[PDB]
Design a protein around this motif. Structure first.
Motif, PDB file in Angstrom:
ATOM      1  N   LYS A  17       0.805  -1.217   0.000  1.00 47.31           N
ATOM      2  CA  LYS A  17       0.000   0.000   0.000  1.00 47.31           C
ATOM      3  C   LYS A  17       0.842   1.274   0.000  1.00 47.31           C
ATOM      4  O   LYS A  17       0.432   2.276  -0.594  1.00 47.31           O
ATOM      5  N   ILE A  69       3.653   0.593 -12.898  1.00 43.52           N
ATOM      6  CA  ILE A  69       2.208   0.375 -12.886  1.00 43.52           C
ATOM      7  C   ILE A  69       1.670   0.366 -11.457  1.00 43.52           C
ATOM      8  O   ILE A  69       0.532   0.789 -11.218  1.00 43.52           O
ATOM      9  N   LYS A  70       2.474  -0.083 -10.484  1.00 41.77           N
ATOM     10  CA  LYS A  70       2.060  -0.014  -9.087  1.00 41.77           C
ATOM     11  C   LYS A  70       1.929   1.429  -8.618  1.00 41.77           C
ATOM     12  O   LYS A  70       0.967   1.779  -7.925  1.00 41.77           O
ATOM     13  N   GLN A  72       1.356   3.988 -10.629  1.00 38.42           N
ATOM     14  CA  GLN A  72       0.199   4.524 -11.342  1.00 38.42           C
ATOM     15  C   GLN A  72      -1.105   4.143 -10.653  1.00 38.42           C
ATOM     16  O   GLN A  72      -2.002   4.982 -10.497  1.00 38.42           O
ATOM     17  N   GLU A  73      -1.223   2.885 -10.218  1.00 41.20           N
ATOM     18  CA  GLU A  73      -2.433   2.448  -9.528  1.00 41.20           C
ATOM     19  C   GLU A  73      -2.570   3.115  -8.164  1.00 41.20           C
ATOM     20  O   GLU A  73      -3.682   3.465  -7.751  1.00 41.20           O
ATOM     21  N   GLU A  74      -1.453   3.303  -7.455  1.00 37.53           N
ATOM     22  CA  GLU A  74      -1.492   4.001  -6.171  1.00 37.53           C
ATOM     23  C   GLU A  74      -1.902   5.459  -6.342  1.00 37.53           C
ATOM     24  O   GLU A  74      -2.685   5.986  -5.542  1.00 37.53           O
ATOM     25  N   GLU A  75      -1.390   6.123  -7.384  1.00 38.84           N
ATOM     26  CA  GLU A  75      -1.788   7.499  -7.663  1.00 38.84           C
ATOM     27  C   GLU A  75      -3.258   7.584  -8.050  1.00 38.84           C
ATOM     28  O   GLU A  75      -3.958   8.521  -7.648  1.00 38.84           O
ATOM     29  N   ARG A  76      -3.744   6.611  -8.829  1.00 41.21           N
ATOM     30  CA  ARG A  76      -5.156   6.587  -9.202  1.00 41.21           C
ATOM     31  C   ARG A  76      -6.050   6.381  -7.984  1.00 41.21           C
ATOM     32  O   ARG A  76      -7.100   7.023  -7.860  1.00 41.21           O
ATOM     33  N   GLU A  77      -5.645   5.495  -7.070  1.00 39.06           N
ATOM     34  CA  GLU A  77      -6.425   5.267  -5.857  1.00 39.06           C
ATOM     35  C   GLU A  77      -6.388   6.478  -4.932  1.00 39.06           C
ATOM     36  O   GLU A  77      -7.387   6.792  -4.275  1.00 39.06           O
ATOM     37  N   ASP A  80      -8.672   9.098  -6.563  1.00 38.50           N
ATOM     38  CA  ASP A  80     -10.080   8.728  -6.453  1.00 38.50           C
ATOM     39  C   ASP A  80     -10.614   8.999  -5.050  1.00 38.50           C
ATOM     40  O   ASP A  80     -11.741   9.486  -4.893  1.00 38.50           O
TER      41      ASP A  80
END
Lengths: 81, 25, 125, 55
Positions: A17, A69-70, A72-77, A80
């Motif tokens: 996380k 990509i991890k 990117q997904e952390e920034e997206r979460e 959001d």
RNA sequence: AGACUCUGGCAUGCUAUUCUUAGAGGGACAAGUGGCGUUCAGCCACCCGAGAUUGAGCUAACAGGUCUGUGAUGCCCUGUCCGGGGCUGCACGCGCGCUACACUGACUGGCUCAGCGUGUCCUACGCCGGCAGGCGCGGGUAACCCGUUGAACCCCAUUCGUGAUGGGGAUCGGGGAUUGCAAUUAUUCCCC
């Protein structure tokens, strides 16, 4: 000495996380363990910090696309929420 | 209210009921 | 050089070879018009009459089947032919012909590109 | 082996194949081997500050 | 040969405090380096480092039982093989399942497509008899041989034609063959 399974699980969830905020050596990883977990046990804190340091040392020798990509997904979460 | 009760008795309930029934590779 | 594609069904699996030629259509070593159930013969005439027989005179296609029933094999044959032509006109021919073939073949029927994802559900105690 | 998900793991049969169906599949295409797969495709408490509790 | 709990080596840091005190906070987490390594778990050696481990507490049982040594223990009484027989024999009530009650059908001939299992009982092939089945020789302890598991519905053509009828087959008689100590109360199959 061996690593306890709950230490492994805590290191996994912490490095999953909050991989961005963790640093290279042991001191800043212990600091991230300080203001990310209250962690009343000192020995558990030390083992968790050391294993997270070893985990990120092993991860940083791997490919870059998974880290990218991890992040990117952390920034997206984070955006959001 | 009174008119709300009269019209609720004059109408029929409807709306929500979830009925659970029922490639790449 | 040539293109090999596959067509799928419930248990009917077909392979299809499309290459250069004079327009020969062959299924299981036989032409397309004498598959034994004659009633679905227009199904075997659904793809080609959708496109025009003059265009097929540069491609020779041969389809082999195994598995399934009669009509499942027929559906596998026609879907394999349709995907063979769109793959042949995508890899070897420009993208506009593939696009217009795909558009007309997807507004005619849905199953002619991806087969119907249906199979028998197993019995459990 | 060196990937992120492999390290962080909670720690006849080999003849199975998996096709993927997008673009139509050509067996004689040299890049068709990218479309075949040899394997199957596919707890702590939070405080008021948001910090986890590990024990 | 404790991967149990706790803790100590150094504090010129805090409190009434560098020498005596007693509470708290740091400090060690295998941390780093080089080799042996399934190239990841572990192992060996070494540097920095007070500390890479020294001490305090922690073996035990048989809800399976056995072998048969035990308490004049408590409560209750004082079978064997052999031959045959029926194991639903049928006026009726109550339900599971098959057949059709025809025409979208039945007969004949041709035609052509699956999947789940198994075997020293599955059988390939040659000879005889229309078939029930025999004879002979091979393959198989198994994705190899049966088995490119050549199936039925369906498809094409003929005959039949509203008729308790070429539908439906019950119940019967006879013959033959197969399975086995034994088939009658029709084991079973083929034919009429």
């Amino acid at each position: 000495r061996v690593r306890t399974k709950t230490v492994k699980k805590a290191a996994r969830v912490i490095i999953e996380k909050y991989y961005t905020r963790l640093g290279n050596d042991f001191h800043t990883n212990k600091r991230v363990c300080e203001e990310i977990a209250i962690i009343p046990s000192k020995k558990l804190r030390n083992k968790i910090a050391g294993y997270v340091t070893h985990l990120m040392k092993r991860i940083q020798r791997g490919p870059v696309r998974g880290i990218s990509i991890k992040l990117q997904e952390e920034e997206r979460e984070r955006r959001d929420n | 209210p009174l008119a709300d009760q009269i019209l609720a008795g004059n109408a029929v309930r409807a709306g929500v009921r979830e009925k659970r029934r029922g490639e790449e590779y | 050089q040539s293109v090999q594609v596959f067509g799928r069904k419930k248990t009917a699996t077909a392979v299809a070879h499309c290459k250069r030629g004079n327009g020969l259509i062959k299924v299981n070593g036989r032409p397309l018009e004498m598959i034994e159930p004659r009633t679905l013969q227009y199904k075997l005439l659904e793809p080609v009459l959708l496109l025009g027989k003059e265009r097929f005179a540069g491609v020779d296609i041969r389809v082999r089947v195994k598995g399934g029933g009669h009509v499942a094999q027929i559906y596998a044959i026609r879907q394999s032919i349709s995907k063979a032509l769109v793959a042949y006109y995508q890899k070897y021919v420009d993208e506009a012909s593939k696009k217009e073939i795909k558009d007309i073949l997807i507004q005619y029927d849905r199953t002619l590109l991806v087969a119907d994802p249906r199979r028998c559900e197993s019995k459990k105690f | 082996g060196d990937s992120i998900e492999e390290i962080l793991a909670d720690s006849r049969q080999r003849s199975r194949a998996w096709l993927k169906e997008d673009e139509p599949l050509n067996f004689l295409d040299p890049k068709v081997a990218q479309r075949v797969l040899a394997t199957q495709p596919g707890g702590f408490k939070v405080s008021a500050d948001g910090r986890l509790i590990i024990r």
